[PDB]
């Protein structure tokens, strides 16, 4: 062990100073785009790899099975485990141009409009026009189109994606790659802290079923108002068509909120206008998101935060790229690049970002290696959460942004609802369901033959949505998703949500809370904020069911917490639909 | 002033805004206890079996629904004899409905539980929620439920509608009032 500790000791020594030039590059890149800074980042990331990869393999000289302190061990594994090595050098060069070759599909994908082929759409535009439309012919061709011309050409590559990978996790002792991609979940200790990875497939199964009671309600609701959008194309017991989802993919519902609010007289809260009317600005923006994370016992945002981040569209000339992003870039440098406008979008994003810098802040002390969140989905639904409630009536009234004598709409309580519902309980079973369908494909539960028969059987019975039009097997729908084609794992997005609310619910009862969850505010609660930070410190260092217990006093995932949230949504959406809730496959 | 006429049941607490022992000359105390210590009397009919319901930081339904004292309490019956009351109704829940049809603001509601329509400390009860309470007091139901509006409007000009529940006790003794006394500087 000693030998192990001195080894690690000196790695994360120079890991941060590495790690840090390579961050410090690909920040310059995105905040200033061109040959100069691209060529920094690339030089960078490079020294970087092979530093680490360096030390991975002198990793190899220190057995886990000498090994006593729970620090050394898990930081071993992470720098020990081969990942892609484990493949011959043909199969590691394949899998990397495969992978390549599917983004660049996907990306540079683009569907034409079958009876005008010289009016054609990138997919930029088809997203555009799947998020806005209300004609059904015209969401129907596009939806189609992009099965045809780029989910027909990842098909291929997707078969032959998932043999390498399976065999690069066999190599590093997993089942599968599915299992493979479920090992970021697994934890080892005494207790009942440990977590297999066949626990996950039992946790999201058991959580899916807790939650299918509440989508039920909401998808009969939806279907009951397109049903009258697109008069004798929709059955009333039946599946929804999926071009009519609000999407391309039918992951958000969000978009459907015009067709089917439930009180269209009434408006949600929006104070975009009283932000400009009080002459808001980027830096106020942020300013306030400090204050909300320091009035619950947080950190305070660095001076060379404030300095170095970009909270504004540069005006120089200079090229970016605004989507917003957090950054952690070592030896205490924290910084946020965001192209912040006047609006609450964008008011409720700051709270978002600077919610994963509190996070990165928090376990800054610990080992490199280790410096990152409990899991996957913890990082998003610590953001989350701060958005959910910084959004409330509450805050935003004493921020100044809500009108005081503002009142209590039950029927704007409800619009607010069924639009969060659209966004965050629509979604669960298609990323349930898609996890689901992917681990099976790369277990062997689901063979080629039956690729879609079984994703669209699973679509009809899981989320309740139908193919408009028959596929076979040349076809690849889960391909034609940026996370699928890209090799990303989907199913942080589930745990991501059902831990959002018992993180949200624990620090709630903390807070003393009494009434709807939706209507939860954390602020000036120090109490559930030292809760919070008692979990965030430890990074990973810890068991994330350890992690857990600390906010959630809890070792397990639990979907109550969401169906609290949501409620006073179900009761509503329950005595709307009567007995006509539910569907048939 | 107080005693005279009849007693307001505690959905619908009177408000008004002098010696002690002349006020104990007019009523019997069982409880008298204060919270950290122009004077303002928040005062309704409330049973003294269950006077516990009175009483800062415990849980009832008297608290949440019907009135919340903001921060001495004084629980006390007396004959009127202003008059006494009948029974005694409290408020055990209420909660905030949304039309079925949009199309119709005076048509059939959809009421929602969790909706929860607090008192909020030294609030009457919402007018949706009195109203309630009004016609428990009247129905003869032993527990009246009702959906109503009472003249209060939503951001739109519509009607704000709630469902409350009015559960109406017999008291013991029929011969005295027992009353509720919330006296703030
Ligand atoms: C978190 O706690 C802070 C205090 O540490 C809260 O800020 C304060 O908000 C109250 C109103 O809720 C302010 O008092 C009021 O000011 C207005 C004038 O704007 C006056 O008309 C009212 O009669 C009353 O005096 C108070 O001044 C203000 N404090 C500061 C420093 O701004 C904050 O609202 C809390 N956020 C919460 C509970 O969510
Ligand atoms: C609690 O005490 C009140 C009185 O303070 C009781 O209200 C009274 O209830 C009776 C019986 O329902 C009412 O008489 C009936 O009136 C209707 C007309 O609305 C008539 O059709 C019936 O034939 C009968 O005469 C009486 O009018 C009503 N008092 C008042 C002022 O309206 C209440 O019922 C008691 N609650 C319980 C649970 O005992
Ligand atoms: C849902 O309705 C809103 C309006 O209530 C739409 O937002 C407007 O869209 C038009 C057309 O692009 C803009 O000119 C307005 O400025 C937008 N208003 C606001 C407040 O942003 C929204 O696009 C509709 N959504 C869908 C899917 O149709
Ligand atoms: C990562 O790769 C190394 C090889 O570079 C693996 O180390 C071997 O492990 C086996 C036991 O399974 C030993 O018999 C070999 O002698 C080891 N070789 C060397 C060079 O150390 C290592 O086990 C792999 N990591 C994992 C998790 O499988
Ligand atoms: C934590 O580890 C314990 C074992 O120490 C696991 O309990 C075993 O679970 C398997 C599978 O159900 C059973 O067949 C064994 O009989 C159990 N052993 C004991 C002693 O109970 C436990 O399931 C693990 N916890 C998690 C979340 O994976
Ligand atoms: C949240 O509410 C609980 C009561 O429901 C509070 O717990 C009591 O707090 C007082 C001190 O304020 C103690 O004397 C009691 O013994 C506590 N009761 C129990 C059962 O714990 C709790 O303090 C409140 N939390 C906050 C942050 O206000
Ligand atoms: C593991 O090593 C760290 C030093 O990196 C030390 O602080 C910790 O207490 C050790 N834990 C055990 C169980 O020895
Ligand atoms: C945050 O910054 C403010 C302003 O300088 C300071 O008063 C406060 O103590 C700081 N809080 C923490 C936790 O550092
Ligand atoms: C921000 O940092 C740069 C670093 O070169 C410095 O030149 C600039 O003056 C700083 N701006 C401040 C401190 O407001
Ligand atoms: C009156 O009581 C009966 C019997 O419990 C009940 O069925 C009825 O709904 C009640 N009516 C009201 C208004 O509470
Ligand atoms: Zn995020």
Not at chain 1, 195 to 212: A, C, G, M, P, T
């Amino acid at each position: 062990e000693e030998k192990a500790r001195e080894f690690l000791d000196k790695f994360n020594s120079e890991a941060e100073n590495w790690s840090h030039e390579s961050a410090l590059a690909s920040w310059d890149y995105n905040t200033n785009i061109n040959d100069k800074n691209a060529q920094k980042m690339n030089e960078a990331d490079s020294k970087w790899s092979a530093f680490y990869k360096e030390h991975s393999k002198l990793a190899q000289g220190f057995p886990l099975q000498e090994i006593q302190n729970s620090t050394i061990k898990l930081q071993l594994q992470i720098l020990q485990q081969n990942g892609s090595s484990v493949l011959t050098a043909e199969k590691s060069k394949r899998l990397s141009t495969i992978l390549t070759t599917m983004s660049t599909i996907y990306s540079t994908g683009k569907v034409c409009n079958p009876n005008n082929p010289q009016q054609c759409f990138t997919l930029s535009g088809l997203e555009d026009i799947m998020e806005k439309s209300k004609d059904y012919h015209q969401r129907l061709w596009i939806w189609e189109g992009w099965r045809s011309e780029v989910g027909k050409q990842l098909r291929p590559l997707y078969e032959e994606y998932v043999a390498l990978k399976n065999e690069m996790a066999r190599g590093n002792n997993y089942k599968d790659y599915g299992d493979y991609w479920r090992g970021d979940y697994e934890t080892e200790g005494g207790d009942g802290y440990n977590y297999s990875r066949n626990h996950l497939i039992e946790d999201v199964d058991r959580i899916f079923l807790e939650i299918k009671p509440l989508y039920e309600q909401l998808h009969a609701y939806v279907r009951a108002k397109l049903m009258n959008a697109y008069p004798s194309r929709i059955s009333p017991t039946g599946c929804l068509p999926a071009h009519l989802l609000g999407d391309m993919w039918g992951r958000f519902w969000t978009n459907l909120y015009n067709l089917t609010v439930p009180f269209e007289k009434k408006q949600n809260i929006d104070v975009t206008d009283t932000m400009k009317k009080q002459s808001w600005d980027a830096e106020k923006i942020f300013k306030e998101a400090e204050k909300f994370y320091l009035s619950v016992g947080l950190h305070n945002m660095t001076p060379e935060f404030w300095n170095n981040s970009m909270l504004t569209e540069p005006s120089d000339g200079r090229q970016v790229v605004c989507h917003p992003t957090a950054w952690d870039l070592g030896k205490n440098d924290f910084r946020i690049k965001m192209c912040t406008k006047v609006t609450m979008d964008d008011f409720l994003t700051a709270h978002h970002e600077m919610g994963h810098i509190q996070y990165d802040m928090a376990y800054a002390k610990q080992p490199y290696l280790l410096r990152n969140g409990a899991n996957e989905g913890f990082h998003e639904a610590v953001g989350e959460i701060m958005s959910l409630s910084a959004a409330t009536p509450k805050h935003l009234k004493d921020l100044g942004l809500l009108a005081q004598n503002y009142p209590e709409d039950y029927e704007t309580e409800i619009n607010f609802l069924l639009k969060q519902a659209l966004n965050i309980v629509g979604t669960l079973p298609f990323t349930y369901m898609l996890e689901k369908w992917r681990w099976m494909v790369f277990e062997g539960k689901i063979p080629k033959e039956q690729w879609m028969e079984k994703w669209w059987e699973m679509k009809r019975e899981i989320v309740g949505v139908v193919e408009p039009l028959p596929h076979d097997e040349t076809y690849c729908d889960p391909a034609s998703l940026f996370h699928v084609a890209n090799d990303y794992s989907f199913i942080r997005y589930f745990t991501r949500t059902i831990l959002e609310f018992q993180f949200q619910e624990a620090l709630c009862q903390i807070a003393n809370h009494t009434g709807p969850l939706h209507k939860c505010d954390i602020s000036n609660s120090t109490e559930a904020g030292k809760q919070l930070k008692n979990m965030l410190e430890l990074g990973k260092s810890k068991p994330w069911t350890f992690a857990l217990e600390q906010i959630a006093r809890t070792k397990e995932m639990d979907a109550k917490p969401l169906l609290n949230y949501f409620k006073p949504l179900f009761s509503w959406l329950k005595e709307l639909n009567g007995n006509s809730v539910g569907w048939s496959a | 002033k107080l005693f005279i006429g009849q007693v307001p049941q505690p959905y619908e607490f009177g408000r008004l805004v002098y010696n002690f022992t002349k006020l104990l000359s007019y009523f019997q105390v069982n409880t008298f206890q204060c919270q950290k210590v122009s004077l303002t009397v928040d005062w309704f009919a409330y049973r003294v079996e269950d006077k516990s319901d009175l009483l800062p930081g415990s849980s009832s339904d008297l608290q949440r629904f019907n009135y919340k004292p903001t921060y001495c309490l004084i629980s006390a019956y007396t004959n009127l004899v202003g008059v006494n009351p009948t029974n005694y109704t409290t408020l055990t829940n209420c909660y905030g409905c949304v039309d079925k049809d949009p199309a119709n603001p005076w048509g059939d509601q959809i009421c929602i539980p969790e909706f929860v329509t607090e008192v909020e400390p030294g609030f009457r009860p919402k007018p949706s929620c009195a109203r309630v309470g009004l016609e428990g007091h009247i129905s003869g139901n032993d527990t009246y439920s009702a959906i109503v509006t009472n003249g209060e409007l939503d951001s739109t000009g519509d009607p704000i509608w709630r469902k409350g529940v009015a559960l109406t006790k017999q008291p013991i003794d029929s011969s005295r009032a027992d009353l509720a006394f919330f006296v703030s500087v």
